Design a binder for this molecule. Structure first.
Ligand SMILES: CC[C@H]1CC[C@H](N2CCOCC2)CC1
Ligand SMILES: CC[C@H]1CC[C@H](N2CCOCC2)CC1
Ligand SMILES: [Zn+2]
Ligand SMILES: [Zn+2]
Ligand SMILES: [Zn+2]
Ligand SMILES: [Zn+2]
Lengths: 360, 360
């Protein structure tokens, strides 16, 4: 059975489980069940399933090099699908709540869940809570007797928390740290002193890399009972690196990829986000250019946003991107090596992850 | 050591742990640590700590009848405090997100967290996520080697999910079930056919009783290693009953307790909530009164809200409350009995829970 077909089948099975348990154990009625099935489909399906599929792909790699009964291979693949769906639903939880937080209009060329006429923010916040609770219901049901249950739950729990901290770093990235104060409305930075490479790195590492790269790779190891084929410090370092790279790309596309191809109107400029472009720009600009950046950044006025766009386009940022890109290709290859020692299999999965990221 | 002093001390210890781990392991900076410490204090302190204190009180009851070393008594009390704080922080998570969902202004005579000038909804949604993640960080840290770890986590997980489902039942309680549809904006019910005792009961059971009553009692048993001193079906039935009773009181006070004494302007009438008053009113009203209720309910106009208030006050609802109150006193006493068999200790704790609820 092809891996995608398997992964999508398991969604139908998990959905049916969740909804069936709502009726048999939570006293739900058919119309509320239907609303939650619609919610589930709309918030969880539609992407490429990169994150869930990585869990499957890692597990399929160990299956080729490890002796097992047929029934065990099937169980391991089924566990990888369920775990992959836990990461997809975790993502979904975050997408729903982030879109509410940020006033987003569209994602994947379709309205944000909260903007659906019969949803509203009042329901969408809680819909998002339910999405994350589902991930735990899946874990406890499907993995109740698995030796990896504790490690999976503890790992999931740490990644979730990192992601939340990451969101906090992100939403506060345009404030002066020393000005943060629940009692006082937060002004945007005037100096941009906190738009550094290290600070950017901290945002991206927590907000994205933990859930997008670390968790799918390690989940694959956990369901394969194969955490000993790796040096965990290496899996960390490689995932952080691939993760950062991926966010840099999204940061560049927010600005420069047409809204139709992007699936949303990018607003990082008007939101004053600490993006790769703003940081990298500020790292090379002269005093006149820094002045002009400061006069136009984080402002809804399209002229001022077009001013920021002009500075970036004129600053030869492609040269900086290319150089960052060469250094990451370099470091990632070195990490794949250092992993190839213990597991050609895992190094190969990490190689494929890297390729899908690099080639998008 | 008095139990409250102990419980509050453990908060300072857990806070210090959480914040220290953010700095040593999540790369946090002092001003973001301060923002989260403020967040934590403002969202988690200020109530009576009924829910967390019940965990402690249950455990103190078993300590009086069970042989243990001093060091073990201290460990059990410390575990009960931590677990009690997990329920308090779970509550906090829900209060923060609910207040955002509902457009609330005040709770406990102070502004809702999201309304604080340097918070905003963009941050408060995620602050709420962090609050719930904290409960898991506490559990994994403090209970890492405890035999009850799995049962605690699985229980916590089910209660959380029930609470979320409960919120869904609550926010949709004024819609016709057959009209729920993410694609279509939801009109308020015109027939009130779903304002029944059974339906009300389903809302309250999921939204409130699981986290307020079931979880503190069972957590106390779990940390005491004492789940065998009880028939779990009885602990369930008694908690549902005490839980319903408590919500009926809050439903009555939303309407009839002055805003200064209540700590918020009650809006159940204008929100068209399926409250004990609306259900009980509709269960005894004549055709003329039902007409008048339908013409005035779920409307911001203070005259129409004062019209609903007049109907209730004229409908002799105190007679219905008194009768409900006698039947619950009756059934709760019967349940305490049925529990007294296996554990005078646990029956006594449940007796105290009941008294604190009944006497408020
Ligand atoms: C294309 C890169 C995107 C992927 C989605 C990322 N965040 C969405 C909301 O919170 C979770 C993570 C932001 C970067
Ligand atoms: C005095 C009774 C109150 C206690 C708080 C209840 N809910 C608040 C928001 O979600 C969690 C539960 C509503 C009833
Ligand atoms: Zn965001
Ligand atoms: Zn982006
Ligand atoms: Zn509410
Ligand atoms: Zn209320």
């Amino acid at each position: 059975m092809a891996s995608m077909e398997r992964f999508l089948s398991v969604y139908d099975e998990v959905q049916a489980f969740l909804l069936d348990q709502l009726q048999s154990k939570y006293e739900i009625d058919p119309n509320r069940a239907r609303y939650l099935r619609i919610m589930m489909d709309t918030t969880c399906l539609g992407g490429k399933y990169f994150r869930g599929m990585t869990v499957v792909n890692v597990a399929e790699g160990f299956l080729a090099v490890t002796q097992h009964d047929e029934a065990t291979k099937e169980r391991i693949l089924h566990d990888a699908c369920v775990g992959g769906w836990m990461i997809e639903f975790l993502q979904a939880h975050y997408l729903v709540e982030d879109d509410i937080m940020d006033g987003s209009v569209m994602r994947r060329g379709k309205p944000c869940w909260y903007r659906f006429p019969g949803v509203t923010t009042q329901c969408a916040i809680n819909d998002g809570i339910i999405l994350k609770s589902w991930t735990q219901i899946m874990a406890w049901h499907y993995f109740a007797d698995r030796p990896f249950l504790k490690d999976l739950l503890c790992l999931f729990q740490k990644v979730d928390y990192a992601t939340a901290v990451g969101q906090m770093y992100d939403v506060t990235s345009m404030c002066d740290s020393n000005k943060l104060d629940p009692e006082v409305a937060q002004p945007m930075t005037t100096d941009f002193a906190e738009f550094t490479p290290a600070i950017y790195k901290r945002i991206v590492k927590y907000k994205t890399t933990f859930y997008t790269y670390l968790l799918p790779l390690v989940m694959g190891l956990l369901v394969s009972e194969a955490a000993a084929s790796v040096e965990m410090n290496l899996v960390e370092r490689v995932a952080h690196l691939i993760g950062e790279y991926f966010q840099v790309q999204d940061d560049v596309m927010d600005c420069f990829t047409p809204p139709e191809q992007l699936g949303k109107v990018g607003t990082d400029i008007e939101d004053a986000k600490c993006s790769w472009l703003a940081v990298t720009f500020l790292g090379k600009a002269n005093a006149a250019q820094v002045a002009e950046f400061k006069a136009n950044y984080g402002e809804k006025d399209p002229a001022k946003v077009a001013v920021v766009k002009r500075l970036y386009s004129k600053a030869n940022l492609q040269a900086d991107f290319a150089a960052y890109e060469a250094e990451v290709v370099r470091e990632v290859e070195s990490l794949i090596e250092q992993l190839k020692v213990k597991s050609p299999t895992f190094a190969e999965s990490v190689a494929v992850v890297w390729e899908k990221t690099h080639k998008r």
